[PDB]
Structure formats: structure tokens, C-alpha cells
Design a protein around this motif. Structure first.
Motif, mmCIF file in Angstrom:
data_model
loop_
_atom_site.group_PDB
_atom_site.id
_atom_site.type_symbol
_atom_site.label_atom_id
_atom_site.label_comp_id
_atom_site.label_asym_id
_atom_site.label_seq_id
_atom_site.Cartn_x
_atom_site.Cartn_y
_atom_site.Cartn_z
ATOM 1 N N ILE A 75 0.833 -1.197 0.000
ATOM 2 C CA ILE A 75 0.000 0.000 0.000
ATOM 3 C C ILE A 75 0.869 1.250 0.000
ATOM 4 N N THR B 55 0.605 5.612 -1.801
ATOM 5 C CA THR B 55 -0.163 6.592 -2.558
ATOM 6 C C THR B 55 0.682 7.246 -3.641
ATOM 7 N N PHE C 124 -4.863 12.278 8.424
ATOM 8 C CA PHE C 124 -6.206 12.116 7.884
ATOM 9 C C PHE C 124 -6.702 10.685 8.042
ATOM 10 N N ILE D 220 -11.257 -9.403 -0.477
ATOM 11 C CA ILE D 220 -10.177 -8.439 -0.317
ATOM 12 C C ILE D 220 -9.736 -8.488 1.138
ATOM 13 N N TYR E 285 -7.017 -7.438 4.050
ATOM 14 C CA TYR E 285 -5.968 -6.525 4.477
ATOM 15 C C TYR E 285 -5.115 -7.187 5.545
ATOM 16 N N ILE F 127 -11.200 3.967 7.446
ATOM 17 C CA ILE F 127 -9.940 3.591 8.090
ATOM 18 C C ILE F 127 -9.380 4.770 8.878
ATOM 19 N N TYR G 127 1.405 11.528 8.953
ATOM 20 C CA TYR G 127 1.980 10.825 7.808
ATOM 21 C C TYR G 127 3.052 11.710 7.192
ATOM 22 N N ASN H 133 5.186 12.885 4.501
ATOM 23 C CA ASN H 133 5.262 12.769 3.048
ATOM 24 C C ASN H 133 6.702 12.714 2.573
ATOM 25 N N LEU I 276 -2.509 -5.463 0.638
ATOM 26 C CA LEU I 276 -3.803 -6.052 0.318
ATOM 27 C C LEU I 276 -3.646 -7.338 -0.482
ATOM 28 N N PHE J 138 -8.835 5.793 -2.795
ATOM 29 C CA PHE J 138 -8.653 6.411 -1.490
ATOM 30 C C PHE J 138 -9.370 7.748 -1.443
HETATM 31 C C1 LIG Z 1 -10.197 -4.810 3.461
HETATM 32 C C2 LIG Z 1 -10.555 -3.762 4.504
HETATM 33 C C3 LIG Z 1 -9.384 -2.827 4.789
HETATM 34 C C4 LIG Z 1 -8.915 -2.079 3.550
HETATM 35 C C5 LIG Z 1 -7.464 -1.629 3.687
HETATM 36 C C6 LIG Z 1 -7.113 -0.606 2.608
HETATM 37 C C7 LIG Z 1 -6.020 0.406 2.967
HETATM 38 C C8 LIG Z 1 -5.388 0.245 4.349
HETATM 39 C C9 LIG Z 1 -4.341 1.324 4.613
HETATM 40 C C10 LIG Z 1 -4.947 2.686 4.932
HETATM 41 C C11 LIG Z 1 -4.619 3.711 3.855
HETATM 42 C C12 LIG Z 1 -3.402 4.565 4.190
HETATM 43 C C13 LIG Z 1 -2.757 4.985 2.875
HETATM 44 C C14 LIG Z 1 -1.545 5.860 3.079
HETATM 45 C C15 LIG Z 1 -1.679 7.160 3.744
HETATM 46 C C16 LIG Z 1 -0.649 8.238 3.560
HETATM 47 O O1 LIG Z 1 -1.016 9.077 2.492
HETATM 48 C C17 LIG Z 1 0.729 7.669 3.251
HETATM 49 N N1 LIG Z 1 1.277 7.006 4.416
HETATM 50 C C18 LIG Z 1 1.688 8.762 2.791
HETATM 51 O O2 LIG Z 1 1.253 10.026 3.241
#
Ligand SMILES: CCCCCCCCCCCCC/C=C/[C@H](O)[C@H](N)CO
Ligand SMILES: CCCCCCCCCCCCC/C=C/[C@H](O)[C@H](N)CO
Ligand SMILES: CCCCCCCCCCCCC/C=C/[C@H](O)[C@H](N)CO
Lengths: 238, 252, 275, 58, 60, 275, 58, 60, 275, 58
Positions: free
Chosen positions: C85, C87, C105, C134, C136, C173, C182, C184, C209, C230
Motif C-alpha cells: 500500500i 499513494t 487524515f 479483499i 488486508y 480507516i 503521515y 510525506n 492487500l 482512497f
Molecule cells: C479490506 C478492509 C481494509 C482495507 C485496507 C485498505 C487500505 C489500508 C491502509 C490505509 C490507507 C493509508 C494509505 C496511506 C496514507 C498516507 O497518504 C501515506 N502514508 C503517505 O502520506
């Protein structure tokens, strides 16, 4: 159960949705919050900072730092044009990649005043005067200093205070312009002329450099989100 | 007038006579860490005179063809007295800074510097899929230098002034706490810089907090009888430095 | 309800006050209003800086990656897919996030799944509805190595099950970082001796994932392609920085080729001629 | 447990209703009505502030 | 009936759901509750007990 | 809202107080705080023991068994399936429950049903939607012995009917034990003469599930595989015990092969060398 | 018949609404907000308690 | 969740519907409103104005 | 609750009052009530001018355009479609809007999507459910040039996704003009020298829609045809004008061929004969 | 946050309930109950108004 009826728009995914969804990790203890200096609550806080304008983007001066230098020197008669561009923050090639041009290129409508700040980076023994004119459209581009002083201008005398401000007034038919180019919301022309020449003493260099700055005033706004036309990718970033 | 400024930190004093102002960060003055934002549990170390004082780096020479310079700053003070020793014996450090840059000329010289103080200036590489050595990002008190064109050295930073090593527009680099040294009005540029991080304390060897950048926009220029050698001197003073997690000396 | 500033009226002036003369060498942006230089009228202005806040600028759904996997294959690795994972593989959401150095966030994740019947000799089938899974995996958990592997049980890991034709799956989440934001950008190394890897790749550590078909081996191949969206909400952001001029190259570093500062004009003064 | 607040309308010419349904604050909708700002830390980031009519570097 | 609109996440099964579901045995009389010594309300009560460390885990 | 303990400041000490000297021979765990040995500062700590409680640790859905049955066969026993209910055939939920000796919880049961068309010569069909039936039989009830048997009527037994493509079926189940807690371990016999069976197999006695297709004989075989998910909620737990080191063997007993206590080091003292 | 209680938020910076819909208490959601503890029966399980500064087996 | 039952008329599109639907551009700042002379609130305001009648519509 | 005017009773009159004598040369419409000329009774009238208001007259859904696109083709431009947004290609909604010169309304947009299997040799398929995507591009954004183009990501542009068989998709749209009203007529030029284009084509500038199938290349062609329905709500309208006599020709101009004023009678006086 | 208003019924012989569900005023239903008018700007659009019994151009 309760009798209900489904409306159009059911079971769709809109990108600008604002609904509620369940958490995948219930009762997750989020880490505490820390005071960090420089918190941003609005991109308009960012857009009001001065930043340097590449006025001299002329045929391979962009691949150097010479694009920021506005050449100026002693003249032979008087009253010639120093530089010039069109007031399009986000469509003009001059203030395209500038900070106001970036933030305005994430939007489609803009409104409000614009400050232009000019710093003289020559020597302490050199003097000079300039005419910093703004001209609303309807006519064309002013072709001499006689046509340039018929609009909004300021005479700047170079002395101890090294920088001047041309504050471009918001003069428009509508309330908003467009960030991209159209004939309907055209804004005008920024031009600069020699009021008097640059008189310098002996054993001092003649040719000097003006730097230029731009920012937004406190009545400035942006309205319509869109994607920036600068992002161009082909494949993923493996 | 307000052009004369005097700054005292410890047993070191700077008196200037053609100053402009003092930029203080994002409005925040450097202070110690409170008990609510703390993470570690043991007593910190606050030397406060033997640490918080002005250290003078190397002078750099500014020719007519000079392009720019940078210093990484928790690492340029590695061998500067009890600040560097207290860096070597502890695990967690936290401080703010005061960055004063000297450059003088006469009323017949012209030129204009931009002194920027950039947090988290993660720099690019000259060859794209290649690893940068640590001797090129930082060199201690010795400055690294930008180049005018596209540099392609081995294990080195992409050295171009019009991208500042980060891939951005160098004109837009004034969003950071900055001043100018214009040689017809100025003599110096004082920047008070607080502690900025995503965590309350951090290690001062593994991390680079910020990067001072001194870039000449208006190139240096003078006549055929004036002085040629014009140095540029950087002086730094840590502020509110405290230290945590004492153990043996090293970094590995 | 916060309006922009009104424009106040002014008249002629002749005095020693100089609003237009300043000094930009102090790092100071001049606060000059148009009623300081020219004569203005009174304008009661009703514009609102509403759709420029940091909440409204970032809270839009953005495709971060495309995930492809099949339902019958000779090799077992093409029947499932995985994604570490980040971005930073699509340039739009990456460049929108990299205006700031640190962010905080909550995330709102939406999957859009489409299936296409692959080309074969026996396309005349009657396939019941495909069901996708799916899973995680938080960082450190066990990894499935086949579609029939027993690590797909989801006793503790979060999961979501979707039948074909419904609404897209959506879950929320929270803020998952071990620090206060976070990061950057991370200017630093991974090892204390200043070796290892240089950049933000040390601070990713978000999990990964996993994607498969809950159904068994079908009698015709079908290629599923699921797109991850996202949405950053509940946004705080600190210490801004200039946008990136240059085109990206990779996800793990910040490296580039040098790009010109802007577009050339070939002249420096405008005119009423062909400009 | 309902909360009533005004809608985004234009000028010169409302009151939606919201109830939260989940036990966590990460499930709530986006806070798209915070319109405040303070550019005093980016513009004017100096000691010994300037009064805009004085020569200011006098 | 009442006009409603389905959001994303409908008709899915999440392992960490916290919803309500009907009972398969309505009005089932649950047996009474007894005070048993050693009730645990938190695994952190368990983790605070000392326990012996195998430091000498060296080659059989 | 229950926080963890704050760290209080301390100074130098020189006295006859000895917090570090104790006696572990009394079965007593010392209550030594870091402000008793070294000089500490004041730390206002905001951490919450929230996601470690016995409710949050066990209340996660876990696959307990896989049930397979078909829709047309030569033998009638492969067209339906049955399962005697236990939680001791999958090691994850078993090892999570065996931290304690006695437990008291309500159950939330979720079924996930998938169907796969079997390999045959006449795969080109058009099958209408399959409907499944899950009948629960309390201990002592009559047992169906065919798919067309008249014991599938469910006049008193609990049942659930699911059409293909919907949400998974979910129902709640109360605390069903004849004693005051589900006994995870029973050290004892079944007969009063101390013969019979030894272990918890006397105290299971929970009933058993039954699975078939409500549809009749189809003209092509389809294999359904339904997965049972238990979720323990409303949890109370007593008298904890150490986790199991050894791998399990069976469901009915507790027997094992001996396992080493931990992983070997091959040395006993650390160094800055290759450790 | 609604009940209002606070949500799980972080520190240094809510009020969801719940209505029960079924006649049985086995249908209710999980009680995931009981954060109390007492390790006085596992640690310190002794008669004639110890005062942590005394030699305690003095 | 809440037990409900669908009535006839569900999932249809009637041209004379009067329901609520989500916005594709949330928090969009609409431009201000201006007083323009000649505002119409009813077509019956228009129909009460005299207008000339072509009575002599006879063969070209 | 606003009724029409009551009819008041009257008697005989003989005086110098003249309600029937007026002067229409002043641009004045006479306010003559039937109780001014003849003897009337008292009529309590309960009629309501309800279904003639500007809200009830315009707020009806109207088809504005038909959009056609396919799912597999030799040329990539026939697999997607686009439409520059106007209300002036169907004459009913155009003529209903052109009663006024300026309007101000919110829009409610509804799409009706139908798919038809094209004629081919391999019509005996089993196609899973088609999913469509409708992306709105505000004026100035990037344009997709293929169905597999990366501009279909919708990170900032509004979008809607619809699976086959559901309700029609519906979203609301606010007042989007840069002026104070949607100008139905613009008497003027585009350039300041009075050249360029003449008409309302300068003031359209509303963006344009895009249509494709989210699914990939199928093994048989299917033609989708989606119909766009606008519904003007929250209506204000100014400065009315006569309805159009003549048939329209184009969308961009107002041009016509001359039409007779009404239908001919061939006589001028009625009679009890064949009239 | 509910609003109660009368329905459109006939003469000589109600009270529906409306709650708004979205944060924007462009999501609301049509305002189909504004029955007011004023034909004084289209009829009678003159200076020095006429009194309907006088010769009026007398
Ligand atoms: C299947 C259910 C759960 C789904 C999980 C999907 C994503 C899980 C991770 C959460 C998303 C965080 C993504 C990254 C956030 C920040 O932008 C980065 N760390 C960089 O700033
Ligand atoms: C078809 C509707 C009813 C569905 C019936 C499914 C399961 C019925 C039994 C309830 C589950 C109890 C499972 C065992 C609980 C305890 O963990 C064990 N006795 C050992 O502790
Ligand atoms: C995919 C989600 C967004 C859907 C976008 C569909 C239409 C977007 C444009 C809004 C409709 C405005 C139509 C034109 C209004 C006026 O009648 C004309 N300007 C002329 O009066």
C-alpha cells in the motif's frame, strides 16, 4: 418491516460523496496529536505569499536561472519598454509555474486583486525611475509610454527602499474570470517603461537586474475544482 | 534606526549594522518540550550555555559564476564542541536554531542572495536508479555546490539551480522561512528556526532536519578595480537543545 | 460564514505615507490593498473562500492502483494478486498530497471490480455470480501463497466480501501512523551509520492487500480488474512547500531529470503585433 | 441525538439534519464547513512587525 | 414506503462488524450467573504477572 | 475513559528504602515503577488499554469449519452434509479461546456459501438460482438421512434459507450451557468408576448442523462449500492459563508430541559481532 | 428509547446514537467500551500485603 | 438493521418526481443574485397582456 | 393559498363613467371586469393559479440528447461517446425555456441506459452485467481519447457508475453560471471588434460529458444508448418574450425560414353554413 | 429538524412531513407551492396611472 422506496441514484459511486461507512478496525486507539508549527487551513494562505516570476523565459533561458533576471541598463534616449506580459495567472506562460499559477491551475474560476512586487538588485550608487502600468482590455497593447500612462500606473523611484508594489485592481465585467484562455474574460496587460534612465557613476557596472514577485490580495478567491493540466503520466511508477 | 541588531546567545555575540529584520519560523519561537507532548520517560539534559551558542562554519567564495550552496543541519554541527559531543552520546535530540549569514561588499558592488531554510529537503540523484553516498548530501561544515547545468556524476545529487536538487521551481522556493541579502541594502540575514518534525524527539544522525540554501539570483558583478574576493560566512546557534537516552559514543 | 475583505473607498492623497514602497528583503509579503494606491469605491464583497480549504481540496476519491487477477490458470500466482500500500504510483493524488510535508487524515477506501471473459474456445458457458475477497494484512502477518491457502481464513485480519452487481464496497480507516503525522518526505537514512535506503521508503510500513476469487476453478478463464479509491477525510496539514515541476520516475525515490522552469516566449516585450 | 446546522447557500437571497450512526469518529462525514484561515505565519513572519505606512527599513 | 438510498458497503460481510442480528431461539432462558474467582477483564492483567525467561536457549 | 498510569518525577535518594530488593518466592510480582530506581521526569501519559480487553480480543469472526455437499450424485450421502458443533478443529480460534478455563458468551453465526460447477460433458446449461437450507438440531432431535427426507420440515428446529447472491446469513445465539460457563477444559471422566472418555468431550453436547440444496436433482453437478463463522460476544472469562506451545493433533483430546521451549541461540552472551 | 454515548476519539483534540431493535439481549451489539481492570488478584495475591519500601521478608 | 418492506413503484423513474438527490459538486459557491427588472412568477402574468389578433387570415 | 378574484354583483347604470372606453395607445392593458359592462351576480370563485407558475411549468424531466456507444469495435472512437452540453438540440425543452430571456435554476440530471445485442454470427453468449461510466468534465479539463485512456480515473472530475438493471442514476447540480443568470439569448459578438461568432454560442461554456463501458472487450458487440434527462428546479425567470413561430434549424444560431402567422380561413365572416 | 406544512387539497371539503437529508440547498425538492403573482409591471406599466372610470386620455 418499514415500507420504503428507492430513488434514482441508488447503488452508485460518486467521487464527491459525503456519506458514512463502517470502520475496518473498530475501537482503534489513534495516536495523540502534537502542535506542529505551520498549520495550513486554506490554500489561500499559501497563495498570498510572494514568489519570483520568470519574466525572461526567452529561448533557452528557462534551463538556467537567467529566466528570473529582467535586464535593465542605461538607455540612449528614454521611454522604451522594459518587459511585458498578459494578466493571466494560470494561462500566461510567464506566471504559469509560479505558486499562484499552480494553485490557480487546480481551479477553473478566479477573482480578486493581484500584487506585483519589483526588487531592484543593482548597486547602491545607481538611480532610476520606471512606469509600472496596468491597462484593461478593449483596446490592444499600448505601443509607447504615451499610451501606457493613460491607464493604472505608478512611478517608482529607486532609493533606499528597494522594492515597489503595483497592486493590480480588480476591474471586471463579471465576478469571476476563467483560469484557462477565452475571449470573454480577458484581463489586460502588464507593461513596464523607462520614466528616466539609469544614471550610474564611474567605475560602477551599468547593466543591472530587476526581480519580480507576485501574490494575491486579501479579497482573492477560486471556485471550481479540476485536475491540473501539468500531470502527464503514461505507465505506473514501479 | 532598526537596522542595527545585537544577538547574544551564551558567550558569543553578533553585532550587525545593516540588518533588515529577523524572520521567526512560522511565528513560533523555540521552546522546550512540554509534558503533554512528551513520549520518553526519563530526565532530559539541558546544558543551556555549553551547547546553546554560535558556531561558525566555513566561508565560501562567491565568484561571478557561482551557482549556490547547501548545508544539512543536524549534521553540519557534528564536530562543533559539546553540541556535537552531546549528539554523540545521546539517542534522542531536539533543538531549534538561529541561522545568521554574513556577506559584505561596498556601494560599488551588486548582487543578491536568497537565504532559504527548507524543512525535509529530500534531494534527488544524478542517475535516477542509483544510490547517493552520504558524502554528497552532507559534508559537515564544508558546503556542497549546485551546478549551472544538468549534472550526471556518480552517486551524487542532481545539481541544477533551477530545480534546487528537489525537482521544483526555484522561484517558488520562497514559501519557506527566507530572507534576501541584497548588496545595496543588506549585510546579513537572520533566521530563527524552531523544531519541526513528525515526532517529538528524533536522532540527530539518522535524520536530516532541514537544509540551508544560499542561491544568488542576481549574479555578482563589479568593475575592473574593485575587490574580487567576497566571502560568505554562515554562523549557527542551537536553541533550547535537550537530549535523551544516554549510552556509549558512536553512530551505527 | 467567513467572507472575503471588503474594498473601502478612498480619495486623493499627498503625504509622506508610502504603502507602495516596502522591502521584500525581510521575507515579508506586503499587505497592500488597492485602496492604498488608487482611488477605489466601496464594494461590499460576498465571496467565500469555501472550496479552497484543505478539507475540500483533498477529500476527493482518486484511483491509486489497478489490481488484476484471474479465475483459472496453469500457474497459481496469476490467480491472485497483492499490492503493497502506497499513494505514490499515480501522479495526481501524489502531487496533490505533496503540497505539504506532514498530513493527518482518516481514509475512506472504495473498490470498483469488473470482470471480463477471456478469449477461449468454450466461451458458451453459464457462469454463476463471481464473489471476490479483499483481505488486508497489517505489517507482520502471514502471507497467502496460493488461492487455496489456509491463510485466507480472516480470523483476525480485516476482510470484505462482494457479490457481482452490487454497490462498490466501502469501509473507513482511521489514522494509522506510529508518529504524529503521515510524513510525506523523510530526509534521512534507515541505519544509524547513514547507510541503507534514503527517502520516505523507511516510513511507509502500512501493510498490503490481497485479492482472489472465492469461487473455485471455473471451466473458462475470466480476468477481474479491481481499482482502489482512497479518499482522505478529517484532514490536517502542515509546513507547505512548492509543487513539483518535474515528471516522476519511481515510487520509492524522488529522483528526476531536470526540466525547464516554464514555457518559452521567444521575446520579452509584448506588442499589438502577432503575440 | 440529532444536530441541526445551516446549509451552503448563496448570497443576496436550509437547516439539514445529521445523526451519526457508528461507534467510531473515523466513520463520520467530511468536515466541509470550516472556512477559517490565518496567513499571519506565512505572510508577516517577522519579529518587530511593520506598520505599512512607515518606511519600514527606515 | 420511505425513500432511501444504498451507500457503498451494502450487502458485504466485514469480520469486525458490530451490528444487530435476530436470535434463532427467542425468549431462551439463560442459566444464572455465578461468582467464580479469577475473573479477567483485560489481557493486560495477565501480562503483568512475572514469568520465567529461558535465557540459556543454547543448542539443545 | 481509563488512562494508563502517569510517570511521576523523582530526584536523588540515599536511604534505607529498597524498592528494587524484593522476594519473588512469595508468589508476588513487584510493583516497581521506573521512578523508584532512576531519576524520571513528569510524563502525562494518554494511552488507553482499549484494544486489549477480553471483549475486543475475542469478538472477531473466525472460520471454524468448511462444509461441502453437492446437488446430484449416485450416492445420497454426498448430496447433504452434517457437522457436530465444536470450536476445536481450527487452531486459531481454539488457541484464542484456550487462554482461559471457563467462558460465558453469546455467539453470532455467519455462513458464507459458494458454488462451483463440477466438471462434466454437459456444462452448457442455464441453471436457476440455488437455494440452500441450514437446519440446526438441538441435542436429541431426529436426524435426516436423505435430501428428500421428511425430517427437513423444521416445525420446531431453527432454520435459515438463503438465495444465491444475497448477503451472508447471520443470526444471534444466546448462552446455551447447562452449567454456569463453557468449560474449555474438563479434567475428569464420564463414568463414576473413572473409566469411559477423558477430557472435554463429555461436555461438548451442543447439537449439530445440517446442509442441503432446497432445489431438486439438477441436470449437472454443482459443488457447494459453506464456511461457518463464529463471533463470541458479551464475553466473560475466568482463571487464565499459559498458551499452548505444542501443535495440536486431534479435536477430542489434548495430546501432543513434546516441543522445545523456544528457538535456540547457539551462544549465551551478545556482542557487537555477527549477532 | 434512544441512548446517547461518546465515541472513541484520540487525545489532545462524537455522541453516536443507538436504538435496540430486538426483544432479546443476545441480539445486542458488542460491549466494546468497558476499559476497567484490576490486577490485584494476579499480582499481589498474598495475605499480609507488602509495602514496597520495607524489606518485605524482613 | 431496520426491517423494511418495498412497495410497488420502487426503482422506477417518473417524470413528475419530487425527491432529493445528492449533488455532484459539494459546497459549490453559487454566484450572488441580482435584482433584474421584469421578474415572472406566473405565466398568468404573461397571459393578461393584450396582443394583436390576426382576424384577416384569409388565403395568403 | 391564493384564490382568483371573485365576481361582484352589479345593477343598471346610467352615468358618465366609461370603463369600456379606453386607449390602448399608451401601452396599457385595460382592467375591465365583467361587472363593469353587464349585470353580473355574486360568484364566490375557488380556482387557484397553481399549475401555471414558473416552477410548475418548467420542472418536468425532458430528454435533451441521445448518446450511442458500443463495447467492441475495429475503430476506438465508436466504443465511447461525448456530448457538449446544451439544451438546444430538442425543440420541446428549448421552446419551453425560450419564453424568457434570463433564467436561474438548479438542474436534476437523470440517465436512462439501455443495451441491445448487435447482429453477429456468435449471438449465443452468456454476458455478465454491463457497467457504465459517465464522467463530467468542467471546461478546460483533459479529454480521454480512447476507452483504455488514463484520463478516465476521475480523481477530481465528477463521475457516476451504474450496474445494469438498477434504478436510473440521478444527481443534483447547482447554478453554474459565471453571471447572474443563464442567458437564453445573447445579442452580441465574441470579439471587441464586432467580428467572430454572433449569438448565444459564446455564453454556453458548460463542459461536456463522456460515456464508455467499464468492462473490457467482449466477444460480441452490444450497442448502448443512454438518454439524458434535465429537470430545472428552483426556478427564477425574467423579461418574457413571444414564443417562436418558426421551426428551428440548428443549435448554434437562431436562423429560420419565414413562416405564416397562423392558419388560413379562406373567408372572414362566420355563418351557420359550412364553417 | 422536521417541517410540517399543508397539502394541496381541493375546495369545499393534509400536513405532510419533510426532513432535508443533504448538506446542500441544490439537493432540495422543488418549491411547488409559491402561488403569488404581480402583473403590475406587464399590465399597467405606465407613469401617471389610470383610474378606469375617467376617460383617461381625457
Ligand atoms: C479490506 C478492509 C481494509 C482495507 C485496507 C485498505 C487500505 C489500508 C491502509 C490505509 C490507507 C493509508 C494509505 C496511506 C496514507 C498516507 O497518504 C501515506 N502514508 C503517505 O502520506
Ligand atoms: C440455523 C440457525 C442456528 C445456527 C446454529 C449454529 C451454532 C449453534 C451452537 C451455538 C455455538 C456454540 C459454539 C460453542 C461454544 C463454546 O466455545 C464451546 N462450547 C467450547 O467453549
Ligand atoms: C456525472 C455527474 C455530473 C453530470 C453532469 C450533467 C450536466 C452538467 C451541466 C449542468 C446542466 C446545465 C445545462 C444548461 C443550463 C441552461 O439551460 C443553459 N445554459 C441555457 O439556458
Amino acid at each position: 418491516g418499514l415500507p420504503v422506496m428507492n430513488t434514482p441514484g441508488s447503488n452508485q459511486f460518486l467521487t464527491s460523496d459525503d456519506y458514512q461507512s463502517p470502520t475496518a478496525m473498530p475501537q482503534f486507539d489513534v495516536t495523540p496529536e502534537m502542535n506542529i508549527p505551520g498549520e495550513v487551513k486554506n490554500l489561500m494562505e499559501i497563495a498570498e505569499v510572494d514568489s519570483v516570476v520568470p519574466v525572461n523565459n526567452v529561448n533557452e533561458n528557462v534551463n538556467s536561472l537567467e529566466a528570473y533576471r529582467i535586464p535593465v541598463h542605461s538607455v540612449t534616449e528614454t521611454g522604451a519598454q522594459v518587459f511585458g506580459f498578459t494578466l493571466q495567472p494560470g494561462a500566461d506562460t510567464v506566471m504559469e509555474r509560479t505558486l499562484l499559477g499552480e494553485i490557480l491551475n487546480y481551479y477553473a474560476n478566479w477573482s480578486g486583486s493581484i500584487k506585483l512586487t519589483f526588487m531592484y538588485c543593482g548597486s547602491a550608487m545607481a538611480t532610476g525611475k520606471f512606469l509600472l502600468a496596468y491597462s484593461p482590455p478593449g483596446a490592444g497593447v499600448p505601443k509607447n509610454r504615451r499610451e501606457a500612462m493613460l491607464g493604472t500606473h505608478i512611478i517608482w523611484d529607486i532609493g533606499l527602499q528597494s522594492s515597489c508594489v503595483l497592486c493590480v485592481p480588480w476591474i471586471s465585467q463579471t465576478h469571476y474570470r476563467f483560469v484557462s484562455k477565452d475571449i470573454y474574460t480577458d484581463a489586460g496587460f502588464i507593461t513596464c517603461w523607462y520614466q528616466t534612465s539609469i544614471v550610474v557613476p564611474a567605475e560602477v557596472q551599468n547593466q543591472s537586474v530587476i526581480l519580480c514577485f507576485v501574490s494575491a490580495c486579501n479579497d482573492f478567491s477560486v471556485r471550481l475544482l479540476r485536475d491540473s493540466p501539468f500531470v502527464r503520466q503514461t505507465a505506473f511508477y514501479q | 534606526s532598526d537596522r542595527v541588531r545585537s544577538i547574544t546567545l551564551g558567550n558569543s555575540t553578533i553585532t550587525t549594522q545593516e540588518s533588515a529584520n529577523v524572520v521567526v519560523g512560522y511565528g513560533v519561537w523555540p521552546d522546550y518540550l512540554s509534558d503533554e507532548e512528551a513520549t520518553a520517560e526519563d530526565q532530559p539534559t539541558q546544558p543551556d550555555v555549553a551547547t546553546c551558542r554560535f558556531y561558525t562554519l566555513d566561508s565560501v567564495s562567491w565568484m561571478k559564476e557561482s551557482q549556490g550552496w547547501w548545508w544539512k543541519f543536524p549534521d553540519a554541527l557534528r564536530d562543533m564542541g559539546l553540541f556535537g559531543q552531546n549528539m554523540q552520546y545521546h539517542y534522542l535530540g531536539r533543538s531549534g536554531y538561529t541561522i545568521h549569514v554574513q556577506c559584505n561588499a561596498s556601494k560599488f558592488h551588486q548582487g543578491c542572495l536568497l537565504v532559504v531554510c527548507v524543512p525535509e529537503a529530500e534531494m534527488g540523484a544524478a542517475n535516477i536508479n542509483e544510490k547517493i553516498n552520504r558524502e554528497h548530501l552532507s559534508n559537515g561544515e564544508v558546503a556542497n555546490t549546485f551546478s549551472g547545468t544538468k549534472s550526471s556524476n556518480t552517486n551524487d545529487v542532481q545539481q541544477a539551480v533551477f530545480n534546487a536538487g528537489m525537482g521544483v521551481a526555484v522561484g517558488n522556493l520562497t514559501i519557506f522561512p527566507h530572507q534576501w541579502i541584497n548588496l545595496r541594502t543588506n549585510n546579513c540575514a537572520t533566521i530563527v528556526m524552531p523544531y519541526i518534525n513528525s515526532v517529538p524527539m528524533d536522532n540527530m544522525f539518522r535524520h536530516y532536519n532541514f537544509t540551508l540554501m544560499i542561491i544568488p539570483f542576481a549574479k555578482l558583478d563589479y568593475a575592473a578595480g574593485s575587490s574580487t574576493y567576497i566571502p560568505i560566512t554562515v554562523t549557527v546557534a542551537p536553541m533550547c537543545a535537550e537530549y535523551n537516552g544516554l549510552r556509549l559514543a558512536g553512530h551505527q | 460564514v467567513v467572507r472575503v475583505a471588503d474594498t473601502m473607498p478612498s480619495g486623493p492623497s499627498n503625504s509622506e505615507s508610502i504603502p507602495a514602497l516596502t522591502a521584500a528583503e525581510t521575507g515579508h509579503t506586503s499587505q497592500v490593498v488597492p485602496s492604498d494606491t488608487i482611488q477605489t469605491r466601496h464594494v461590499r464583497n460576498f465571496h467565500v473562500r469555501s472550496e479552497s480549504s484543505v478539507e475540500n481540496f483533498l477529500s476527493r476519491s482518486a484511483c491509486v492502483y489497478i489490481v488484476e487477477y484471474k479465475t483459472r490458470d496453469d500457474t497459481p500466482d496469476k490467480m491472485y494478486d497483492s499490492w503493497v500500500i502506497n499513494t505514490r504510483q499515480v501522479a495526481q493524488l501524489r502531487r496533490k498530497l505533496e503540497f505539504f510535508t506532514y498530513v493527518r487524515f482518516d481514509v475512506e477506501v472504495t473498490f470498483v471490480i469488473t470482470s471480463v471473459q477471456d478469449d477461449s474456445t468454450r466461451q458458451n458457458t453459464d457462469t454463476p455470480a463471481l464473489t471476490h475477497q479483499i483481505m488486508y494484512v497489517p505489517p507482520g502477518g502471514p502471507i497467502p501463497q496460493a488461492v487455496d491457502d489456509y491463510n485466507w481464513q480472516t480470523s483476525t485480519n480485516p476482510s470484505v466480501f462482494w457479490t457481482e452487481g452490487n454497490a462498490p464496497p466501502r469501509m473507513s480507516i482511521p489514522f494509522m501512523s506510529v508518529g504524529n503525522a503521515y510524513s510525506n518526505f523523510y530526509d534521512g537514512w534507515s541505519h544509524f551509520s547513514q547507510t541503507g535506503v534514503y527517502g520516505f521508503n523507511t516510513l511507509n510500513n502500512m501493510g498490503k492487500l490481497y485479492f482472489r476469487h472465492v469461487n473455485d476453478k471455473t471451466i473458462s478463464p475470466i480476468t477481474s480488474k479491481v481499482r482502489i479509491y482512497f479518499k482522505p477525510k478529517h484532514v490536517k496539514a502542515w509546513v507547505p512547500r512548492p509543487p513539483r515541476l518535474c515528471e516522476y520516475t519511481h515510487k520509492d525515490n524522488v529522483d528526476f531529470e531536470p526540466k525547464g522552469v516554464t514555457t518559452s516566449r521567444t521575446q520579452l516585450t509584448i506588442s499589438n503585433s502577432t503575440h | 441525538g440529532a444536530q441541526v446546522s445551516t446549509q451552503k447557500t448563496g448570497a443576496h437571497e436550509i437547516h439539514y439534519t445529521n445523526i451519526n450512526y457508528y461507534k467510531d469518529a473515523a466513520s463520520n462525514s467530511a468536515n466541509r464547513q470550516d472556512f477559517t484561515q490565518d496567513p499571519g505565519k506565512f505572510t508577516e513572519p517577522v519579529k518587530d512587525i511593520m506598520v505599512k505606512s512607515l518606511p519600514a527599513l527606515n
